[PDB]
Structures are given as structure tokens and as C-alpha cells.
Paper text:
Target-based azole resistance in Candida albicans involves overexpression of the ERG11 gene encoding lanosterol 14α-demethylase (LDM), and/or the presence of single or multiple mutations in this enzyme. The azole antifungals inhibit sterol 14α-demethylase (CYP51, SDM), thereby preventing biosynthesis of the essential and fungal specific sterol ergosterol, and resulting in the collateral synthesis of toxic sterols. We have used, as surrogates, structurally aligned mutations in recombinant hexahistidine-tagged full-length Saccharomyces cerevisiae LDM6×His (ScLDM6×His) to elucidate how differential susceptibility to azole drugs is conferred by LDM of the C. albicans Darlington strain. Phenotypes and high-resolution X-ray crystal structures were determined for the surrogate enzymes in complex with representative short-tailed (voriconazole) and long-tailed (itraconazole) triazoles.
Boat-shaped crystals were also obtained using Ni-NTA affinity and SEC purified ScErg11p6×His I471T mutant in complex with either ITC or VCZ. These formed within one week across all experimental conditions tested (43–46% PEG 400 and 0.5 M glycine, pH 9.1–9.6). While we were unable to differentiate the ScLDM6×His wild-type and I471T structures from the mutation at I471, we detected spectral changes consistent with modification of the electronic environment of the heme. Furthermore, consistent with functional modification of the heme, the insertion of I471T into the hydrophobic environment near K151 gave blue shifts to 416 nm in both ScLDM6×His I471T and ScLDM6×His Y140H I471T preparations, as well as lower spectral responses to the binding of VCZ by ScLDM6×His I471T. The presence of the I471T mutation reduced the spectral response due to type II binding of VCZ and ITC, with the major difference observed in the trough region of the difference spectrum. Despite these changes, the type II binding curves showed that both VCZ and ITC bound tightly to the wild-type and I471T mutant enzymes, with each drug giving IC50 values of ~0.6–0.8 µM in the presence of 2 µM enzyme. The appearance of the AO seems more complicated and requires either small (ScLDM6×His Y140F in complex with FLC) or larger (ScLDM6×His or ScLDM6×His I471T in complex with VCZ) changes in conformation of M509, plus a modified conformation of the H317 sidechain in helix I involved in the proton channel. ScLDM6×His in complex with ITC shows that the long tail of ITC occupies the SEC, with M509 adopting a conformation closely matching that found in ScLDM6×His Y140F and ScLDM6×His Y140F I471T complexed with VCZ, but not ScLDM6×His or ScLDM6×His I471T complexed with VCZ. The capture of the water molecule by ScLDM6×His I471T complexed with ITC but not the complex with VCZ may have implications for catalytic efficiency.
Numbering used by the authors: 8 to 534
């Protein structure tokens, strides 16, 4: 029976003869049907985690994961346990929930997983080339080592009065406050916190020159570049549209400003220990002798500042929002300010910040309820066996880990959805290496990453901005608490999170009503 093969060919010929309606109709029915037939077959493998079923091909569970990622995970965890895959915008994501997932992903061997393959398409078009994820891991490890050189205790000692002054200036001059002229007012915390975060971070990490730029129309380039930081970069990283060209123009104009300051400092040999720019100028030689270019130094600055912008601004937005319905906590924090700072007669110092455990537990608890990053990912480079299982995660998959999900589990945090800074009494550290330690190129960090509380990640990709974030959030909240009481308009409460930015932001407009503790207090200086 070669007669059959002839009819194969005849059928192929008649196929290409169909009316164009039926040919496009067939162009959609065939992949859909195949997609379901493939999942059903896939769901038989014993060496693959369960795969979340989905109707639309390529799209996958993208809509559900994107809008309600922790709800998606809880549903999947109830059905399939702690390991399961789901299709997402063309990728397969293998999720591993809970502390053993933290260990599987955050401590995966450098050979098995790649962060830069996962992230580069999100960050490289915003930050620029050659740094962070547009470079091999060992370069990244050392860039973190260079940034850490400016994030020392002694640096934080000089940043505290800089950050504090910036907050007072903001209270004095910003339209949102004007404390010298109003005793009460209403703000949207998603306007005020992003602005306060960029002003305080610029002044301390970037220096006075870069801070001064933000009082000009130059500040619009930060807005344009900020807009370019979006999950759309995973599908359309470059499209010949205005959004993208404004992004690229901002990246070039902003990195040009940094290089101009860098080259002017070197031209005058004016390199002190003022800011992170001084620091990187003195210290950006890799261990194989290669030196970072002024452009790579500038792109590193953008990426570090931009990442710290979003996480910190989100977090201080959430602190304000939780305290607006917790007058008890504001009272509690105010008393600690009065006791640590001798009734407000002692100036805030970095040392005194460490003696304010309730303030630091408020940051800590906010990073529990509202982790700014619901998902961290790697691309799997070599097949991985899931220990004590029959599961194998093949190369070309992605592993996804979500400590923010574990932060919200009653099993690890009793009453996980109640905001209680006292769940941290006797434990106000920003995190804790609770045992051994290892160095990946930027300093010794906890060897284990099994803690259920992992707001700053762990392993080779762990955050290097933790202590800067606490310093900055600490000075800002110390001043907010000693200066203002605040509350919600009638009937309003803590807004639910918006996860689509991939930074967990309050849903707007998130407004609070502030009023001066001392209506007669005046903020000195010029305006
Ligand atoms: C509330 C504040 C912050 C939180 C909760 C936070 C959280 C995190 C987390 C969870 C990671 C691990 C990423 C991964 O494993 O994929 C990370 C990495 C990182 N963060 Fe932060 N971060 C914060 C603030 C900052 C700040 C202020 C800076 C800079 C001053 C910064 C710079 C970095 C850097 C350089 C990395 C390393 C990424 C890598 O190795 O690939 N972060 N952060
Ligand atoms: C890649 C990015 C991210 N954003 C959102 N969901 C997951 C993510 F991994 C992020 O980790 C965010 N971030 C972490 N600490 C501060 N910012 C990041 C890290 C380093 C950096 F230099 C810039 C930067 F954006």
C-alpha cells in the first residue's frame, strides 16, 4: 500500500486549495488543537512538574499570573503542590514555592541557571550596554563589589544628614506639603514617595551636582527613562514608537550627564569620597585588569539608581499607607523618636538610627506584607533534577522563585495578612545570615537561603542595596513620624496591590491626609 502515500500528497495538494477563510481558520484551529493534545500528553510525564493547563497558545497563563500572581500561585499550589510549570508569553516557567524553592533557585549552581539570560531584555534597553545583565556573571559580581564600596557604615554616616535635609526641603518646597504655609493637606503617596525617593537617593548616591539637575527640565528625562522600565520589554524591547525613542534619548542624555561629571572630575583630578561617582571613579577595575568605561560606569549608576528607585519608593508608599490606618503604630513610633532623640533635641545620626528597633521593624514588616518584587527568575542552562523528586527541569526552561509569596503564608507568618511590627520584636535586623557564609565576589553572605523571610534575595544575586534602603527609608520615616500625623479620607483604607508593573505598587490614587504635629514649626533656609 503505497496508495496511501499518494493520497498524502493529494491531500497536501487539496489542502493548499482551500478557500482563504478556511485556510486562516485552519491556521488557528490547528495550533489550538495541537496545543491541547500536547498538554494532555505532557501531563503523563513523571519527570516533569505538573504544567498549569491553558487554552490560548503562546499567551499561556500570562493574564492570570500578571494581574494576580500570588493568587495564581495559591491556586496552583492547592492543585499541584509546590513545584509546577506554567506557560507565559512563549516561555515555560517552573515555579518552586516555599523555602526549598528559595534554596533551589537562589543557590542554584552558576552553571545551571542564568539571571542575565532571564533579565537582560528588561534592563539592558533601559540601563545601557555592558553592565548588570549585559555582561557575564563575574563582571556583575564585581560591579556589585564596586557599588558596595560606597555603601559602608561611614558612608551611611554622611548620607543621613544629606537625606534628612532633602526630606525637610521637600516638606518646605513641594506643592504636596509646604509646611511653612499649610498645617494640613492631602497627598497621593504615589506622587510624593517617587519624588522623595529620587531626591534623597540622588543627593546621597549621585552627589550635589546630580541632585541639582533634578530642579531643572532635566528631571523629565528621568520620567522618560522610568517609563521605559516596563514588563513589555519582555515582548517588545524595541518598537519604532515614541515611547521607545524617548526612553533611548533619556538613557543617552542621562548617561551623558554622568560621564560629563565623571570626565570633568578626572580632568580636574577632583576625585574625593563624596558620592558613588567618586567611588566608582577610584574603583572600577576588574580582576583581569580590564577597566570599566565611563559609559559602563554611567549605565551602572542608572541601573542601580533605577532599581533602588522603584523598590524603595514602593516600600515607603506602603509604610505610609499601612500607618494611615494605624494611629497606634504612629504613636508607638513617635514615642521611640522622643526617647532615642532626647525629645527631638538630638540630631538624627546613623548610629541613632540603629537604636530605633520599632521603626526598623515597621520597614521589616512592610517588606513582609509588600515585597516589591513578586517574582525573581533565572533561565535554566542545564537540565536540573529536583532533589527528592522525580522532576527534571530541562535547559531552556525558567525557574521562578517568590519569597514575597512565602511572606504571606500563615504557616510561616501567623496571620500573614495582618500588619504587626511586633511580630519582629527581639529581631529587628534587616535580614540575618543565621550560620555559615560564602563570598561570590562582593562580600560574605549567608550560605543558606532557606529563611522564609527573604526580602533581599540570597545567593550570588542577593541585593547589595539593603543597608542603603534601610538607611534611606529610616531617615525618611523618622522625619515623617516626628513631623506629621496622617490618616485616610473617610471610608478609604489600604489599597490592594497592583502587580502588573512587576513592582508591587499600591493601586491609585492612594491618598492620605497629613497634618503637622507642630502647626507652628518652620523649616529654615531659602525658597
Ligand atoms: C526595599 C528595597 C529593596 C528590596 C526589597 C530589594 C530586593 C532585591 C532582591 C530580592 C534582589 C535579588 C534579585 C534576584 O535574585 O533576581 C535584589 C538584587 C539587587 N538589588 Fe535590591 N532591593 C532593594 C533596594 C535596592 C537598592 C536601594 C539598591 C541600590 C542602591 C539595590 C540594588 C540591587 C542590586 C545591585 C542587586 C543585585 C542583582 C543581581 O545580582 O543580579 N536594591 N534586590
Ligand atoms: C531586575 C530587577 C527586577 N525588577 C522586577 N522584578 C524582578 C527583578 F529582578 C531588579 O532586581 C529590581 N531591583 C532589585 N533591587 C532593586 N531593584 C534589579 C536588580 C538590580 C538592578 F541594578 C536593577 C534592578 F532593576
Amino acid at each position: 500500500v503505497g496508495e496511501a502515500l499518494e493520497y498524502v500528497n493529494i491531500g497536501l495538494s487539496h489542502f493548499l486549495a482551500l478557500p482563504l477563510a478556511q485556510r486562516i481558520s485552519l491556521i488557528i484551529i490547528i495550533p489550538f488543537i495541537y496545543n491541547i493534545v500536547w498538554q494532555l500528553l505532557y501531563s503523563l510525564r513523571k519527570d516533569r512538574p505538573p504544567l498549569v493547563f491553558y487554552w490560548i497558545p503562546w499567551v499561556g497563563s500570562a493574564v492570570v499570573y500578571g494581574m494576580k500572581p500570588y493568587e495564581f500561585f495559591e491556586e496552583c499550589q492547592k492543585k499541584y503542590g509546590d513545584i509546577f510549570s506554567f506557560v507565559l508569553l512563549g516561555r515555560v516557567m517552573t515555579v518552586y514555592l516555599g523555602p526549598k524553592g528559595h534554596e533551589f533557585v537562589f543557590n542554584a549552581k552558576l552553571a545551571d541557571v542564568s539571571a542575565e539570560a532571564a533579565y537582560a531584555h528588561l534592563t539592558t534597553p533601559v540601563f545601557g550596554k555592558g553592565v548588570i545583565y549585559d555582561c557575564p556573571n563575574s563582571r556583575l559580581m564585581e560591579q556589585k563589589k564596586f557599588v558596595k564600596g560606597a555603601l559602608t557604615k561611614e558612608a551611611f554616616k554622611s548620607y543621613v544628614p544629606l537625606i534628612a535635609e532633602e526630606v525637610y526641603k521637600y516638606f518646605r518646597d513641594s506643592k504636596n506639603f509646604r509646611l511653612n504655609e499649610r498645617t494640613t493637606g492631602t497627598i497621593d503617596v504615589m506622587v510624593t514617595q517617587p519624588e522623595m525617593t529620587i531626591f534623597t537617593a540622588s543627593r546621597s548616591l549621585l552627589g550635589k551636582e546630580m541632585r541639582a539637575k533634578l530642579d531643572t527640565d532635566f528631571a523629565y528625562l528621568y520620567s522618560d527613562l522610568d517609563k521605559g522600565f516596563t514588563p513589555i520589554n519582555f515582548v517588545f524591547p524595541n518598537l519604532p514608537l515614541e515611547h521607545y525613542r524617548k526612553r533611548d534619548h533619556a538613557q543617552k542624555a542621562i548617561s551623558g550627564t554622568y560621564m560629563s561629571l565623571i570626565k570633568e572630575r578626572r580632568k580636574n583630578n577632583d576625585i574625593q569620597d563624596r558620592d558613588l561617582i567618586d567611588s566608582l571613579m577610584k574603583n572600577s577595575t576588574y580582576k583581569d585588569g580590564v577597566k570599566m568605561t565611563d559609559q559602563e560606569i554611567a549605565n551602572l549608576l542608572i541601573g542601580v539608581l533605577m532599581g533602588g528607585q522603584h523598590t524603595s519608593a514602593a516600600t515607603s508608599a506602603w509604610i505610609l499607607l499601612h500607618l494611615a490606618e494605624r494611629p497606634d503604630v504612629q504613636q508607638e513610633l513617635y514615642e521611640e523618636q522622643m526617647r532615642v532623640l532626647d525629645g527631638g533635641k538630638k540630631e538624627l545620626t546613623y548610629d541613632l538610627l540603629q537604636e530605633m528597633p520599632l521603626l526598623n521593624q515597621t520597614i521589616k514588616e512592610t517588606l513582609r506584607m509588600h515585597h516589591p518584587l513578586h517574582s525573581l527568575f533565572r533561565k535554566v542552562m542545564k537540565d536540573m533534577h529536583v532533589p527528592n523528586t522525580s522532576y527534571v527541569i530541562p535547559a531552556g526552561y525558567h525557574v521562578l522563585v517568590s519569597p514575597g509569596y512565602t511572606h504571606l503564608r500563615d504557616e510561616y507568618f501567623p496571620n500573614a495578612h495582618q500588619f504587626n511590627i511586633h511580630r519582629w520584636n527581639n529581631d529587628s535586623a534587616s535580614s540575618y545570615s543565621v550560620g555559615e557564609e560564602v563570598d561570590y565576589g562582593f562580600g560574605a553572605i549567608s550560605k543558606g537561603v532557606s529563611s522564609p523571610y527573604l526580602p533581599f534575595g540570597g545567593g550570588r544575586h542577593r541585593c547589595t542595596g539593603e543597608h542603603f534602603a534601610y538607611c534611606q527609608l529610616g531617615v525618611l520615616m523618622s522625619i515623617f513620624i516626628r513631623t506629621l500625623k496622617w490618616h485616610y479620607p473617610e471610608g478609604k483604607t489600604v489599597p490592594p496591590p497592583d502587580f502588573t508593573s512587576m513592582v508591587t505598587l499600591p493601586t491609585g490614587p492612594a491618598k492620605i491626609i497629613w497634618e503637622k504635629r507642630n502647626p507652628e514649626q518652620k523649616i529654615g533656609g531659602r525658597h
